Amino acid sequence: QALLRILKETEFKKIKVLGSGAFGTVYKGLWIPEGEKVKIPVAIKELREATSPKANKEILDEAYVMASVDNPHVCRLLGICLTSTVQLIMQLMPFGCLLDYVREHKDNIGSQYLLNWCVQIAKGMNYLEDRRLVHRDLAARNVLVKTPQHVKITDFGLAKLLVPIKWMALESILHRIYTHQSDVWSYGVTVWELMTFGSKPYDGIPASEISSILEKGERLPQPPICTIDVYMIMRKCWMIDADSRPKFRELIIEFSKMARDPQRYLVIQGDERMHLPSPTDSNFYRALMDEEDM
Amino acid sequence: QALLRILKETEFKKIKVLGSGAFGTVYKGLWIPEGEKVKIPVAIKELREATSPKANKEILDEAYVMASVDNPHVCRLLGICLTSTVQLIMQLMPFGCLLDYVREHKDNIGSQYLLNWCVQIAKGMNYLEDRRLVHRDLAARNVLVKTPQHVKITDFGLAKLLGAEEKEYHAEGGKVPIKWMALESILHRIYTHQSDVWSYGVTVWELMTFGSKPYDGIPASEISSILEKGERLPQPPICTIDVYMIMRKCWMIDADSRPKFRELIIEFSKMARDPQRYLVIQGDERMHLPSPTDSNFYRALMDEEDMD
Numbered sequence A: 001q002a003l004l005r006i007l008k009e010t011e012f013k014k015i016k017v018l019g020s021g022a023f024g025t026v027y028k029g030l031w032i033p034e035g036e037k038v039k040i041p042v043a044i045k046e047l048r049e050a051t052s053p054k055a056n057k058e059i060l061d062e063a064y065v066m067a068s069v070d071n072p073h074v075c076r077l078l079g080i081c082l083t084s085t086v087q088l089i090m091q092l093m094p095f096g097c098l099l100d101y102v103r104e105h106k107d108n109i110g111s112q113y114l115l116n117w118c119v120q121i122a123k124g125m126n127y128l129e130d131r132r133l134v135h136r137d138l139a140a141r142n143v144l145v146k147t148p149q150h151v152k153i154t155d156f157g158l159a160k161l162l163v164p165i166k167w168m169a170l171e172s173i174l175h176r177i178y179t180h181q182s183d184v185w186s187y188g189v190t191v192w193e194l195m196t197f198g199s200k201p202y203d204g205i206p207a208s209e210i211s212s213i214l215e216k217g218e219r220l221p222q223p224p225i226c227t228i229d230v231y232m233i234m235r236k237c238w239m240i241d242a243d244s245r246p247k248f249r250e251l252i253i254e255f256s257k258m259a260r261d262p263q264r265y266l267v268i269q270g271d272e273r274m275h276l277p278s279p280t281d282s283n284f285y286r287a288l289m290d291e292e293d294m
Numbered sequence B: 001q002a003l004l005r006i007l008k009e010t011e012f013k014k015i016k017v018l019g020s021g022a023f024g025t026v027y028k029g030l031w032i033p034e035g036e037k038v039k040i041p042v043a044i045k046e047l048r049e050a051t052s053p054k055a056n057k058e059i060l061d062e063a064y065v066m067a068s069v070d071n072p073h074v075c076r077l078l079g080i081c082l083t084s085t086v087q088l089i090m091q092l093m094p095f096g097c098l099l100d101y102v103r104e105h106k107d108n109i110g111s112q113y114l115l116n117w118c119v120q121i122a123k124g125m126n127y128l129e130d131r132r133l134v135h136r137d138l139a140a141r142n143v144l145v146k147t148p149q150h151v152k153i154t155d156f157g158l159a160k161l162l163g164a165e166e167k168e169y170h171a172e173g174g175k176v177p178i179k180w181m182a183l184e185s186i187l188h189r190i191y192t193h194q195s196d197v198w199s200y201g202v203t204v205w206e207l208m209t210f211g212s213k214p215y216d217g218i219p220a221s222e223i224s225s226i227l228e229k230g231e232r233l234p235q236p237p238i239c240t241i242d243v244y245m246i247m248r249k250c251w252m253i254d255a256d257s258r259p260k261f262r263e264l265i266i267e268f269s270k271m272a273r274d275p276q277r278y279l280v281i282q283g284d285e286r287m288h289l290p291s292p293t294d295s296n297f298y299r300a301l302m303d304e305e306d307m308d
């Protein structure tokens, strides 16, 4: 209601493109509150095709739901601007998306980070589940890095507004059936994405042939750094019987346990030389760019 | 201890001058975290020459205190660079200081904001008093706008850090804020919470006059004489007598009869609920506070911290 601000083209400007796709283009932007002389960095996602007035109201309705997600591991939609292209505005996450982060910091990301990112991502998903929301498009590309210690799931509602075949539960490929437990399936691909430092899933497989290899019992290979304990949890996220997959509350518990003995569950060369931020460095991050409570 | 990050010149850079005061120059800078790529905007303050140098440890000793202040209405020092100069790092506030803000928005700021800014400043000072700390240099210039709805007191502890004696107690531009100082503080270099309440008085008067220069036309060196003779800042035109009497009580010679910040909070909070009864601003009825939509937006974008 008062969670979504309707903006006007006149009061903000796009500065530089950040990322592309098809559905929308992402820009870094500047918000200029009227009557003021300050320029506030924002993230702007402008969507592909123009919409009629009645489509706009279906979008605006959904925007409100997006604007109500209040959890330190899910991005909240802050605002919206509607013309022929519609623009989504939210806080600017300067570190970008977590897929790219792990690829660029491939080998030199410690085990505490990886397992802690698994906790945060599950905590955010479990929040959506508690509110009976279903994401439909969890993947490493859809997790944003606020600070290296603080990641947020993004793009809730965008997939539900308008195909990521290699992240989808089997039931969703064959029957377009989306649930909380189908979200658990993609969560497991996402973890797999992190543990391989952003390898592409089913590399060497047509997207058209994924449902058959899944029916024949094929799953994504164990990552070299993952112990069997972690790989079994991923493998449990990909079971055919959706209801046998773990629930997010359990994944938070399980990964949290592992985050407490990180070098027992992930084997990374040089892990001992990669430590987690001190109390000092982490107060500094929070005071500067990450003041929200957790 | 861990509240104060110690930086090296390698991991941050000054990119733009934001303004110069008697204690030094503020730059917008960039922190570059180790092994990362991103550039994080920050505020950097390079301090001027400090009278009676206290090595580095005594400096760090005060920096840690400045790093300890944890309140929605006082700026915490985040880190420091000790080298050929002393460089303070804190969170960037793009709106800048409240003295510049009320001037550039003179006659377009309603009573709601003015009275709310005074509540927040007194809450800031009340916290310092509660922590047994004295600011020594409260002024409109030393209040930053985080958002128009949210102000914070800055430069805590820089007066005690740099000190600055000599003729600056007679000049009008130096480290000593004569025209904000309590008479006891001008005469005997005495600083308490109650002299802080004198500067609060003057701070509020700058707010209510939309940025006027206090005792304008009177030389700083002459201030302690006119105060001894009963002269005080005059009633701002938008102030009912209720408000002016609070200002004038802040400026009584007997520090013990001045009000205490905790009372200031309650009295300015009471006036904020009926703001047009206490400030007479023309067009006030058409100057409103922000909507919940607007504040939620500011909060989620720029201002995620606690705050009443």
Ligand SMILES: OCCCc1nc(-c2ccc(F)cc2)c(-c2ccnc3[nH]c(-c4ccccc4)cc23)[nH]1
Binding pocket: A018, A019, A026, A043, A044, A045, A077, A078, A088, A089, A090, A091, A092, A093, A094, A095, A096, A097, A141, A142, A143, A144, A154, A155
């Ligand atoms: O990733 C999902 C689809 C792409 C995307 N869509 C969005 C999105 C934006 C506004 C909104 F209202 C809803 C969704 C983002 C995005 C969001 C916030 N901060 C951000 N920084 C960078 C960033 C920083 C540095 C280098 C490269 C990218 C992106 C982003 N990316």
Ligand SMILES: OCCCc1nc(-c2ccc(F)cc2)c(-c2ccnc3[nH]c(-c4ccccc4)cc23)[nH]1
Binding pocket: B018, B019, B021, B026, B043, B044, B045, B077, B078, B088, B089, B090, B091, B092, B093, B094, B095, B096, B097, B141, B142, B144, B154, B155
């Ligand atoms: O008495 C002097 C008060 C000056 C001051 N000192 C500081 C200060 C900085 C670092 C530190 F460690 C301690 C104090 C600031 C300041 C702080 C944060 N953001 C800021 N933006 C602008 C700003 C923005 C736009 C246009 C003009 C000014 C200032 C500022 N201003």
Ligand SMILES: [Cl-]
Binding pocket: A020, A021, A022, A023, A024
């Ligand atoms: Cl896209």
Ligand SMILES: [Cl-]
Binding pocket: B020, B021, B022, B023, B024, B025
């Ligand atoms: Cl200064």
